[PDB]
Symmetry: C5
Subunit: 307 residues, 5 copies
């Protein structure tokens, strides 16, 4: 009933792939388990680097394949080493860089929370069980991440449960429960850039759109609308090119629709004000003085987007 | 005439390449077939991991190469294992990530169907036959697809047919029929994002184009048209940059031309309105009152685009 | 002087790189040639799959290297198999996918003609000759290129010629002539998409530009032109991002320049209309009525663009 | 306590990945260390190239794995050679190209300060220490950066420090201190292109925005403001697409937000001038003559962005 | 002091990386050198293809590793063959595809002169020299043609000089001079595409920019200019997106600044014309008649930019 200790050193997470739901993790991994003792050179432990390891297997060294369950494609294995002890126990060490997969919601784009997860599990062993799992990191929050991508409000989160896999259990009846280490790391999106540089300009554009009501004539009002209309389309484009592509509406992406709407609603009022009259051409007394009433109407509906 | 069991675990479909007609499939695959019984260590089945497998072949172990017929390029093979049973039967297991090809129509872009398909067939064996095929997916539709991209409808279509391959049969007369597994999965595109953020703004922009007939003057009418023209071209760009590039007209793309036409037709009326007159000056009294006759004409053309 | 029959199964191409002049080809290749007989297990021919093939070479099996002359970089060799016959003849089979290069003229962009080419020739053999060559495409022209950019044309083209290579021919005097299979498949560009969505709106835009002459004033005429100018600049951008990048002027690219001229010519006329008078301020009575004389002037130069 | 001399020849930096904080370094690396003396063919030193090196290891030649700690994924090892000297000493030479990572502040974008760094450390040895470190570079500052992208202020550097690694350490009590070479090179972004072609055009536009106050009418003033609004949205787009993507506000990114504001502030004054009056419609006599008082207000706040 | 002849067949140059200063070269390379005579099968020369080569080295065949000094990462080695002669001399042939680097000045962007370079040098041998070097190019110009991106001013140059490498000269005292082939090919920029399709439209816009002086009113003049400003920003974006990214100001990039200035300068005159008066509102009679004096002022500054 083989015991396996596991420790995973995390060096770097990088590259969220918003569409494919994919991120890259570089780091090391450690497995420790005790086997039959052997004579080593001297009596100090014997060290085996890279290319040499595969040879020891051909002479009867059992070395379990540890698969990353949730990695997308075999990861980049850097240097790898074995530490064989004269008393038997064996240490497998390897550096990796791999593209891992997990479910993640991006609907709250400028203010995200995400959880990056690793799932390690032996490739073909059910009564070889994973003893304990450990990780690390070295950072400081809240501090220097007005420089950084986002804050890692969060920490370790170890699991290591057992998985059933109820399919073709008759291949080996009664035994198909595999030991799976699961690690998860929480993180929040530093909104600084998307607020200071995206949320703000869009609102001003939407806000400046309302100043159309202070134009004295009607032709002035209506013609200006199409320039404001064009202004939203441009900002919608600048939004879409730079922001990460997604198959749903982000908070920013909804704000873009809010601009498209606010200007189109004015379009209807500007026209309906002209032809809801007592004669033929009269801008309805009290109607064109929604100058500070359209901003109130827009802000009122923009508080139901929150809850 | 060797019998071969096959089981295919499907983990993930992701990243369709609309231009090249290509999608990626990550998962596992299993092959089982019984051969001459042999002595294993103890009497437990023997487990052979990764590199050791290629060695076992050099001692005369026949292991059929199973090629993916519809894969584009050799796939990324992760971990692989053999299970040699003392009673003869052998279970080949490997994790695979590969880019597969299938016919895909994207003309109805925001409302696709589609069928993701696998085709497995031994690389050099016609008597060796595929016994039975199974597929395993652990997803839920419709449910979390507001965070994903696709809705899946079908869920397990399996075939296992036979192929003729009638070329150069005199090399071996009478025998050239191969056993081919066929897996097919139906799926539908989540129209949500392209409606709320692409179909929606485009219609409003096209709709606002019609309000030009409510401009009083003719210089206003004709001059304003050119501003609307620019608005469509801009939105065509924003459409073209973010939407997946294709060599045919999508539904949006047809709606995009619909705008281009409405504006050029409006241009024609606006000018024809001015010089289809009685004497000096008269803008044809009723023709500038197609204010809600141009909207009706467009929706009529937008209902024959559907069927 | 060994004879070698070769047949090339072509599966798909699909991904043209217009700048690098490059297309991808996936398919199979077969080589058959008769050698000294041998004893096979039983008397059935012996099958060798992939890694085992390289083992047979180390025991003196000569397997000629067939190089793709016009492939850019080593192609992806999928599965490969040998067929060793008891009567001597040997069949080499392999699946390939590679990016090939050929000269391709794209000057007539929306209406291209191309020739996709494979060139196979042994890597180091002058008196080992290719017996006869075969090509298996199956597709059905005119038909499905409604969905794929191209259109298949004339199909199979085989040569099997001799090459001189007169440089360092003194390295091996009197013998430097190689047997080269040459495959060529002609193709035409499906213009449907670029017409309905690029050529057509462009014509509408250029046509609408001429309508400036029906604007009454001169300040109106000149001012509106600058909006038309910006409209043309926008369409080049929308064109340039989506269309395939090239180092020469395509047909579309020329049509784009026509707008730049028509507007700049109008700018000059509209201004010259104002200051070609008898008295201070009189728009030359006939010249501003080139309203349907710019439409005629444009079309005359666009039929000398044809020949 | 094995001594190892190290010299790292740097051939090329380049291709900074501003988002991933990543740069590539091409060059050679040399390891020299004296071992048990013996006999070479003749007495000239023995040279072992590439594929041959891997053979020598299996007969007991210890060659330590030198890992690039800050490389992202195993780097590309070009050619490698061993020089075994008859007096014992051995020279390991290999050409490498790998993607290295380091912390990079880009908040000062057009005037960045970065430090590209190598961190070398043995993969599995605690009393085998790095003797001395050398680097070779051959550059000139301030001079060729007319063309080169990077001004260098420092003249390389070398550390060769000690690392604790206080984890896992009871596996080997008393011994867990590793030797790490650190090489660091200072460099700056060179403002020429971003000033002459990005900073300058932005400033001119913001200045021209203020000339809106010199329009006689109010409709002229307010309508034109929306045109300036549209222009800024365009320029933010042109900046964002071409400039390197970052998760924070660069100097340019800050300058962009100021433009968005100046127009919205002008819009408000233009309006407040109109309705901060003695009657109902009088542009407040002094306030619309902030024509050269908005420029003064802009220049004063743009000096607090510096400090 | 072994003599080695080298001949390099060049098949294709393609894919300039303007930022990284990098180009791709596909072709073959040939090495010829005379050694101890050996007995071959029969007396014909023996041919060794690919995988078989590395085996011959392990039996004492010395084959020098030839490194491309300015190649960025180890290149893709296609097929390789040995021709061992009974009289001793040995011919190494291999097809290579690799990414090479060189310094490239792009400041005169649309009209460059460039020099593509290969640099070959043995990896670990100082008294084995390159006898004579030959390369085969077949590049005729002016003619090729009809147009392209570069033209060819020659065929090549062939140094084959001696290198010092003065760092660590005591590794082997008194002998550290290596033989390095240097091949260089000159090329000139085919400007055709960038003139007709980029330079020409800019001039029309810049020329049309001056037509603002023929606008009658001042509100006409000043308001219209803000539209012209937008036109340049649009064109800079379209320029920068399609044109190759660079770290310095191209000729085009300066022409873009020339527009930015001419339009901003017009703004200044247009306003100064209004307030350099005798009464209060009189447009200074001669100054607004710089309509064809600003074209003259602009053309003069574009001729000292030349020298």
């Amino acid at each position: 009933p083989v015991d396996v200790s596991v420790s995973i050193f995390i060096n770097k997470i990088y590259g969220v792939n918003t569409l494919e739901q994919t991120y890259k993790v570089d780091g090391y991994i450690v497995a420790q388990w005790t086997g039959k003792p052997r004579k080593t050179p001297g009596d100090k432990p014997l060290i085996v680097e890279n290319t040499q390891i595969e040879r020891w297997i051909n002479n009867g060294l059992w070395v379990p394949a540890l698969e990353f369950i949730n990695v997308v494609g075999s990861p980049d294995t850097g240097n790898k080493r074995l530490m064989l002890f004269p008393d038997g126990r064996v240490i497998y060490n390897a550096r990796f860089l791999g593209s891992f997969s997990n479910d993640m919601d991006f609907r709250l784009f400028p203010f995200d929370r995400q959880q990056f997860v690793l799932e390690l599990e032996p490739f073909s062993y059910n009564n070889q069980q994973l003893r304990f799992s450990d990780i690390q990191v070295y950072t400081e929050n809240i501090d220097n991440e007005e420089i950084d991508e986002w804050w890692i409000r969060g920490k370790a989160s170890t699991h290591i449960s057992d998985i059933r896999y109820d399919h073709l259990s008759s291949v080996q009846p009664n035994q198909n429960e595999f030991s799976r280490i699961t690690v998860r790391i929480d993180a929040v999106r530093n909104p600084s850039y998307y607020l200071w540089s995206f949320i703000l300009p869009l609102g001003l554009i939407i806000a400046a759109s309302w100043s159309v009501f202070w134009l004295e004539s009607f032709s002035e009002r209506l013609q200006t609308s199409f320039t404001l209309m064009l202004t939203v389309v441009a900002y919608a484009f600048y939004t879409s090119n730079i922001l990460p592509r997604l198959p749903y509406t982000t908070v920013i992406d909804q704000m873009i629709i809010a601009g498209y709407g606010s200007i189109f609603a004015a379009i209807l009022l500007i026209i309906f004000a002209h032809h809801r009259q007592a004669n033929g051409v009269e801008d309805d007394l009290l109607i064109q003085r929604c100058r500070l009433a359209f901003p109130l109407g827009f802000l009122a509906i923009g508080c139901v987007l929150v809850i």
